[PDB]
C-alpha cells in the first residue's frame, strides 16, 4: 500500500453569521470526506457510499450522541478561551486528530488545537505533554496535563485505535482509495514576450492526487526557476497539475511508482 491517513476535524464558531453552524465535525480518509456532523443537523451522517454500506445504525447512533457532547465541550472551551484573551465578537476554535499508516508499515499520530485559525495546542504522544504557543495555551496545558488517564488514552487512540479504523475504511473503500488512475501528460511550447519561450508541462486525469513533476536540462536538474501548479480536483474524483520553465529540456513525472519523461 501507499501512505494513507485518517483525520477528524472540529470547527467551533462563536456568535455565527445566521447561516454558519456553531459547530461542524468532518472525517476524511486521505482527500476523501467520510463523515459529517453539525450543530444544525445534530446527526453524524456518511459522506461516502462505502461508509453507509459498511457501518451499522449502532455506529451512527452512538457517535451522534458522542458528537453532541463534543459540540457542547467546544462551546464551553471556546467561551473560556475568549475570557482569557479578553476577546469580544466572533472567534474560531479548531481541532484536528489523526493518523497515517505509512508505505513501510510505520505509523504517525497527531492531535492539535487552534484559536482564530492559528496553532494553539500541539499534543506530543511521545512525551505525553501539550505544546503551548502562549500563556493562555499554557494555562489550558497545565489543566489538561493534570489528567494523566486522558493523555495515556489519547496516545493509545492515536497509536492503536486510529490505525485500526483507517485499516477498516481502506478495506470498505478499497475500490476508491486503492485504485490508480495514471496521468495524461502533455508539453506546451510558446513564444510569449519577444525572446522568452515558456514550456508548460500539464498533467490531468490522475488518481491518487499525489504526483511529482519537474523539468530537467540536458539530463541534470534545472538550476532555473520552475513555476509549480497546485494539484487541483477535476471534479470527477481525478486531479490536475502543472510545472513551467522559461527556456535540451525534458519533463519528468512520477506518479504511483511509474516514471515518465517528455523531451522537447
Amino acid at each position: 500500500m501507499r501512505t494513507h491517513s485518517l483525520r477528524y476535524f472540529r470547527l467551533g464558531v462563536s456568535d455565527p453569521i445566521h447561516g454558519v453552524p456553531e459547530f461542524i465535525s468532518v472525517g476524511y480518509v486521505d482527500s476523501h470526506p467520510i463523515t459529517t456532523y453539525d450543530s444544525v443537523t445534530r446527526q453524524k451522517e456518511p459522506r461516502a457510499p462505502w461508509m453507509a454500506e459498511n457501518l451499522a445504525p449502532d455506529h451512527w447512533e452512538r457517535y451522534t450522541q458522542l458528537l453532541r457532547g463534543w459540540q457542547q465541550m467546544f462551546k464551553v472551551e471556546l467561551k473560556r478561551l475568549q475570557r482569557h484573551y479578553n476577546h469580544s465578537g466572533s472567534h474560531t476554535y479548531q481541532r484536528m486528530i489523526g493518523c497515517e499508516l505509512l508505505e513501510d508499515g510505520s505509523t504517525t499520530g497527531f492531535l492539535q488545537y487552534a484559536y482564530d485559525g492559528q496553532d494553539f495546542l500541539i499534543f506530543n504522544k511521545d512525551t505525553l505533554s501539550w505544546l503551548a504557543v502562549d500563556n493562555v495555551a499554557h494555562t489550558i496545558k497545565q489543566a489538561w496535563e493534570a489528567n494523566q488517564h486522558e493523555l495515556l488514552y489519547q496516545k493509545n487512540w492515536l497509536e492503536e485505535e486510529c490505525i485500526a479504523w483507517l485499516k477498516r475504511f481502506l478495506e470498505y473503500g478499497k475500490d476508491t482509495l486503492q485504485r490508480t488512475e495514471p496521468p495524461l501528460v502533455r508539453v506546451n511550447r510558446k513564444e510569449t514576450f519577444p525572446g522568452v519561450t515558456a514550456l508548460f508541462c500539464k498533467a490531468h486525469g490522475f488518481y491518487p492526487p499525489e504526483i511529482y513533476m519537474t523539468w530537467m536540462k540536458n539530463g541534470e536538474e534545472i538550476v532555473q526557476e520552475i513555476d509549480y501548479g497546485d494539484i487541483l480536483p477535476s471534479g470527477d474524483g481525478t486531479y490536475q497539475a502543472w510545472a513551467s520553465i522559461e527556456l535540451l529540456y525534458s519533463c519528468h513525472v512520477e506518479h504511483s511508482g511509474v516514471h515518465m519523461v517528455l523531451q522537447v
Partner: antibody, heavy 108, light 113 residues
Framework: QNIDQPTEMTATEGAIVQINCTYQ??????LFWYQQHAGEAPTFLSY??LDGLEEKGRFSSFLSRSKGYSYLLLKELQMKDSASYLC??????????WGAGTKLIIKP | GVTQTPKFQVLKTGQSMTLQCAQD?????MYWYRQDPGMGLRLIYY???????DKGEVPNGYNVSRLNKREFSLRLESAAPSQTSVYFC?????????????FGEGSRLTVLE
C-alpha cells in the same frame, strides 16, 4: 463482545489474590476495576489503557493490550476486602461492557 | 456527589414509577443502570451531555429526561415483575469516560402482582 472474570475467588487473610479479567472486544479504549461491597454502590479502583502495572497501596492493576487481559492484585488481604470486583472494558464505539463481577471471599 | 431516591420501593404490576438522580459535580454525562444477580451491569439509558439522551442496552419498559445539567430521572411507565432489580444512577465529567464513574446509593425496586 464478551468480558470474562471468575464468578468467585477465595483466599486467606494476609495472603495475596489475583483477580483476572479478559476482554474479547471489537476495539479497546481502556479497562476499569470497581469495588462493590455487599449491598453498596460500586467505587472506582483503577483505569488502565496503556501496558503495565500500577500500585495504589495494597491494590495494583495490570494491563496487557496484546494478551487481551488485565488483573487486580490485592496484597496483605484484610476482612474489609470481602467485596465483589467488577472489571469493565471500552470498545471502539466507546461503549462500556461490564463483567459479571468476582465475589472475593476472605477466610480469617 | 450522586443523590438518588428512593433506597427501596414496592410496586404493583402496572404502577407508574419515577426514580430521581441529581449530581453536585458539574458533570455532563449521566447514566441509568440495573444490577441483576449473575450478570454485569446493564445500561438502560444515558445522557452524553445536557440536551441529549439515548437508549442503552435495556431501554424497553423505561424512558428518561435530562431535566437540566444536574438531574437525570428514570421512569417506569407500567411496572412489570421483570423490572425487579437494583437501579444505579451514575455520572461522569464527559462521555467517553476515561475517569471515575460516580455511582448513586442504589434503588431496590420490587414489582408484585
Amino acid at each position: 463482545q464478551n468480558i470474562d472474570q471468575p464468578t468467585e475467588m477465595t483466599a486467606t487473610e494476609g495472603a495475596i489474590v489475583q483477580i483476572n479479567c479478559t476482554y474479547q472486544t471489537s476495539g479497546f479504549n481502556g479497562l476499569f476495576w470497581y469495588q462493590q461491597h455487599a449491598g453498596e454502590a460500586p467505587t472506582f479502583l483503577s483505569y488502565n489503557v496503556l501496558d503495565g502495572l500500577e500500585e495504589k497501596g495494597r491494590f495494583s492493576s495490570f494491563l496487557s493490550r496484546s494478551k487481551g487481559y488485565s488483573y487486580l492484585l490485592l496484597k496483605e488481604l484484610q476482612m474489609k476486602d470481602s467485596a465483589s470486583y467488577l472489571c469493565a472494558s471500552i470498545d471502539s464505539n466507546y461503549q462500556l461492557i461490564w463483567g459479571a463481577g468476582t465475589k472475593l471471599i476472605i477466610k480469617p | 456527589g450522586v443523590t438518588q431516591t428512593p433506597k427501596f420501593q414496592v410496586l404493583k404490576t402496572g404502577q407508574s414509577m419515577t426514580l430521581q438522580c441529581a449530581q453536585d459535580m458539574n458533570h455532563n454525562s449521566m447514566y441509568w443502570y440495573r444490577q441483576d444477580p449473575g450478570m454485569g451491569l446493564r445500561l438502560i439509558y444515558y445522557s452524553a451531555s445536557e440536551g441529549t439522551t439515548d437508549k442503552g442496552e435495556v431501554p424497553n419498559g423505561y424512558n428518561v429526561s435530562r431535566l437540566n445539567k444536574r438531574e437525570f430521572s428514570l421512569r417506569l411507565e407500567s411496572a412489570a415483575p421483570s423490572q425487579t432489580s437494583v437501579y444505579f444512577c451514575a455520572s461522569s465529567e464527559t462521555d467517553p469516560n476515561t475517569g471515575e464513574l460516580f455511582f448513586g446509593e442504589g434503588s431496590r425496586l420490587t414489582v408484585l402482582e
